[PDB]
Design a binder for these strands. Structure first.
Lengths: 113, 23, 82, 98, 501
DNA sequence: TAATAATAGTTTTTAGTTTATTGGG
DNA sequence: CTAATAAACTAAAAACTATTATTAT
């Protein structure tokens, strides 16, 4: 649904600095979370590949020391927690890349924080 | 407020170091 | 030990002096070393320090390719030692 | 001289310099003579714990792994050092994707 | 406490500030630029934790979210940085004002209400714990909007609005050939001489200030016990702390990013990585060394809980004043945990001042630390001419040496001298007497460290010279005394013995 | 079925080494 | 014929917020 537009905007919302961009990011992430919090049978499938592209984006771009990205990091970790708890064991294709991203996050420059 | 650092609220103004002035 | 020096008054007046430390908060010369739980010697123990480029994926930094710095303003200015 | 049957290679990357030279002198003393990794005759390659096959390939500029060279960690060789005899590389081999 | 501070600076864009009555004199624009750079670097040295901004108005262009015309912000409210210093520096000088007039607009009409609105807005755009208000301005004209009385009315209305919202302003005199003439529009819209001149407090801004001035912070929250159960809330402070150079910030060679530090211990014979548990404290006394672990080492160091237990009373004269071990501390009464402790503090200080006796008290600063014996030295509250305290009230903390701390001295005898020589250097000291003041002796070595630091930061043409005060002006004293020094040399020294070896 | 009380996270001293720096014999 | 040692150096702990689980029903 609108999650495609939303992911496009979030990928476009980290060009300049202007940590208000991070505020737009966190509010947005709240909306996609609650939209995909309760799918019926269908939106979960699109949400899976949305999670794929979003993890890709935060791994390749949200890889710096800006706190506007750090708050995004914690909120999306909680968000992925609740989705995978809700989605159960159906995210087998994304498991190893999630592990790679998470290990990178531990080894990320955020290790100073 | 007089006697306070105009550059620093809550702190007094400090006169520059002078050294000595013998009598 | 003491401090053999000269008192100074202006330029034309001076007195050789031997200053002594009257009161000092003395400290024990001996400090605790580190030994192995089994070897019980410093020889097996080898402490070392590692510096690597945390930003560029823990890329190792030479101990002579390393510089100090100082936080000047809302930033850290690069600065050497010598 | 039980290590004299070892013609291995040591990698400075991932290994502390003091650790690297200590391993070098230990292997030389016990007869183990080092050889370049990209060259032949490499029994083992001394790398860190978290080394990747492609990461090692791009580190050593190797399109392919050298023949007979095992991407083993320093834990196994250190182990063989304290109990003075060799151990298998099982539990120390890093997987090679095809 | 009071958190971050904000200082905001306003200068009108008009040709009056680009010109002077005497061309030898600076332009108001240029003197304002150099003064603002001076206060920026002074604040960077002193209290860089706070927030500063740069904003202009009256130009031919505007930069702000509100899009009010000719209202051009330059630097938002941020901790000052060297890039800000330099990007405000290039506009200094004649060529600086020329390039400013080129790339930046200058000279137009506006409203004071709108600039007040946008400055208050950007002040609100900070999400930090604000401490105080400081919104500086710089103008040589006292009536910028008297053409429209409605503009003056709305300006004073918005000034009342800011002073209602807990905002404080301040006005700087700028040189006016006709006299700046305050109270024409101010002293009523803001919170004396007409001031043809301008120097009213800028001279305090131009003088270099280099310090750290650590804010109000308690050294330790401590609980005092008299015998076993008398609980007292006490707060310990210090009036002096040794000033040290800021620590070096280790960083990479090329990229100059701060490299993180990794520290580890590994085996030699095994070669493998060691473990913290394997670490054992070892010392070698005699043949048999001692095997120990750290935890029980501080357990041995652990003697008593933190607290101050009264060990009695001794007159202040019995202690020998030369016995010091550390910079003296200062305690103040507290009412945080214990209520009414300040009443006890007042009663005891009054009684001890009446009886001029110290209060010996065993001292334990922190857990698992060896205790110590301290005496409580009362201190009164002394005011200045304007009834502002110069000596804080409360108690000083003196430190007494142990037996071992007193180093043995070599034997020294008593030697007498002629009273004629005694009167001679009595006259000598009376010649060169003065009065000590604590606000005249800094460490110029640290000052030179800083000086080189801005010299390298801003690429200053010269390493700024440290104005040392520790060097005596030997020529002056030699002129004042002259033929008295050789009189001493003949009176005391033999006339063949050089002071050197 | 939905509150408030413990409660970590940055500065900032300060002890704890360490050193590299003299003349001692 | 072999030193306290001043300065440098890292370590360690307190102080001040500092929101953040956390019971009641």
């Amino acid at each position: 649904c609108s999650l495609l537009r939303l992911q496009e905007t979030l990928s476009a919302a980290d060009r300049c600095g202007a940590a208000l961009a991070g505020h737009q990011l966190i509010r947005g992430l709240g909306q996609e979370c609650v939209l995909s919090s309760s799918p019926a049978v269908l939106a979960l499938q699109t949400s899976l590949v949305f999670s794929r592209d979003f993890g890709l984006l935060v791994f390749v771009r949200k890889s710096l020391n800006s706190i506007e990205f750090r708050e995004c990091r914690e909120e999306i970790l909680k968000f992925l927690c609740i989705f995978l708890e809700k989605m159960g064991q159906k995210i087998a294709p994304y498991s190893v890349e999630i592990k790679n991203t998470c290990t990178s996050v531990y080894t990320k420059d955020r290790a100073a924080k | 407020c007089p006697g306070e650092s105009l550059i620093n609220p809550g702190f007094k103004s400090k006169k520059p170091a002078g050294g000595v002035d013998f009598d | 030990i003491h401090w053999p020096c000269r008192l100074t008054i202006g330029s034309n007046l001076s007195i050789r002096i031997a200053a002594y430390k009257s009161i000092l908060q003395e400290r024990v010369k001996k400090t605790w070393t580190v030994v192995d739980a089994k070897t019980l010697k410093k020889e097996d123990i080898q402490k070392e320090t590692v510096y690597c480029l945390n930003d560029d994926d823990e890329t190792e930094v030479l101990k002579e390719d390393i510089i100090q710095g100082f936080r000047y303003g809302s930033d850290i200015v690069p600065f050497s030692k010598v | 001289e039980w290590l004299s049957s070892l013609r291995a290679h040591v990698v400075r990357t991932g290994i502390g310099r003091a650790r690297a030279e200590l391993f070098e002198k230990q292997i030389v003393q016990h007869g183990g003579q080092l050889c370049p990794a990209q060259g032949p005759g490499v029994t083992h390659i001394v790398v860190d714990e978290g080394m990747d096959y492609e990461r090692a390939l791009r580190l050593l500029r190797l399109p392919q792994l050298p023949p007979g060279a095992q991407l083993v960690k320093s834990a196994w060789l250190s182990l063989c050092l304290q109990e003075r005899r060799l151990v298998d590389v099982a539990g120390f081999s890093i997987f090679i994707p095809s | 406490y009071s958190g971050r501070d904000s200082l905001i600076f306003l200068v009108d864009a008009s040709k009056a500030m680009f010109e002077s009555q005497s061309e030898d004199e600076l332009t108001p624009f240029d003197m304002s630029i150099q003064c603002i750079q001076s206060v920026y670097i002074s604040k960077i040295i002193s209290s860089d934790r706070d927030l500063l901004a740069v904003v202009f108005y009256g130009t031919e262009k505007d930069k702000n979210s509100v899009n009010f015309k000719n209202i051009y912000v330059l630097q938002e409210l941020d901790n000052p940085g060297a890039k800000r210093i330099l990007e405000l520096d290039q506009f200094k000088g004649q060529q600086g004002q020329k390039r400013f007039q080129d790339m930046m607009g200058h000279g137009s009409d506006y409203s004071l209400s709108e600039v007040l609105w946008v400055c208050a807005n950007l002040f609100s755009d900070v999400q930090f714990k604000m401490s105080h208000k400081r919104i500086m301005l710089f103008t040589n004209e006292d009536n910028p909007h008297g053409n429209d009385s409605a503009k003056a009315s709305r300006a004073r209305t918005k000034a009342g609005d800011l002073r209602d919202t807990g905002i404080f302003l301040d006005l700087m005199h700028l040189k006016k050939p006709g006299g700046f003439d305050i109270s024409l529009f101010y002293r009523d819209i803001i919170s004396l001489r007409v001031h043809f001149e301008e120097s009213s407090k800028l001279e305090d801004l131009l003088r270099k200030v280099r310090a750290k001035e650590t804010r109000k912070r308690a050294l330790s929250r401590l609980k005092l016990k008299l015998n076993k159960d008398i609980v007292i809330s006490v707060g310990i402070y210090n009036l002096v702390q040794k000033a040290l150079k800021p620590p070096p910030i280790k960083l990479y060679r090329e990229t100059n990013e701060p490299v993180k530090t990794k520290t580890r211990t590994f085996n030699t014979s095994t070669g493998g990585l060691l473990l913290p548990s394997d670490t054992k404290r070892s010392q070698i006394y005699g043949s048999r060394q001692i095997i120990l672990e750290k935890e029980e080492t501080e357990e041995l160091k652990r003697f008593d809980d933190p607290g101050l237990m009264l060990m009695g009373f001794k007159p202040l004269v019995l202690l020998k004043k030369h016995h010091y071990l550390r910079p003296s501390l200062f305690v103040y009464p507290e009412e945080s945990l214990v209520i009414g402790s300040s009443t006890l503090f007042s009663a005891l200080l009054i009684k001890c001042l009446e009886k001029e006796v110290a209060a010996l008290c065993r001292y334990t600063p922190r857990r698992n630390i060896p205790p110590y014996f301290v005496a409580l030295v009362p201190q009164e509250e002394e005011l200045d001419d304007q009834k502002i305290q110069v000596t804080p009230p409360g108690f000083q903390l003196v430190f007494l040496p142990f037996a071992d701390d007193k180093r043995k001295m070599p034997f020294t005898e008593k030697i007498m001298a002629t009273p004629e020589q005694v009167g001679k250097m009595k006259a000598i000291v009376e010649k060169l007497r003065f009065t000590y003041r604590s606000d005249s002796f800094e460490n110029p070595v640290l000052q030179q460290h800083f000086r080189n630091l801005e010299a390298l930061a801003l690429d200053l043409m010269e390493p700024e010279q440290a104005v040392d005060l520790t060097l005596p002006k030997v020529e002056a004293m030699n002129k004042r005394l002259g033929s008295l020094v050789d009189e001493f040399k003949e009176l005391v020294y033999p006339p063949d013995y050089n002071p050197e070896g």
